[PDB]
Design a protein around this ligand. Structure first.
Ligand SMILES: [Zn+2]
Ligand SMILES: [Zn+2]
Ligand SMILES: [Zn+2]
Ligand SMILES: [Zn+2]
Ligand SMILES: [Zn+2]
Lengths: 27, 68
């Protein structure tokens, strides 16, 4: 019941949240 | 929109930020655990020791965030 990468990829909001966090970190 | 500086979110590339933190692969995304602290992904079979299945738990934390 832990979150998988697939669970993130299939959810547009979760996916966008993850992209935003990665972009911020890479700044 | 946002795009990874390492892999450009190109599915033909490896990335240990966007995909498995240990092997950088996008394969078997249903077997990659998300750490609830650092939000890195980890194949159950990349962990050492490896997990035979996805834990039945509310949250999971990776060896790095556990500091073990
Ligand atoms: Zn990437
Ligand atoms: Zn990415
Ligand atoms: Zn892996
Ligand atoms: Zn972690
Ligand atoms: Zn690491």
């Amino acid at each position: 019941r832990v979150r998988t990468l697939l669970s993130v990829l299939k959810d547009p909001i979760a996916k966008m949240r993850r992209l935003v966090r990665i972009e911020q970190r890479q700044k | 929109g946002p795009s990874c500086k390492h892999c450009k979110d190109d599915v033909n590339r490896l990335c240990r930020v966007c995909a498995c933190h240990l092997c950088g692969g996008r394969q078997d995304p249903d077997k990659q655990l998300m750490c609830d602290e650092c939000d890195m992904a980890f194949h159950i079979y990349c962990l050492d020791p490896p997990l035979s299945s996805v834990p039945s738990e509310d949250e999971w934390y990776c060896p790095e965030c556990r500091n073990d």
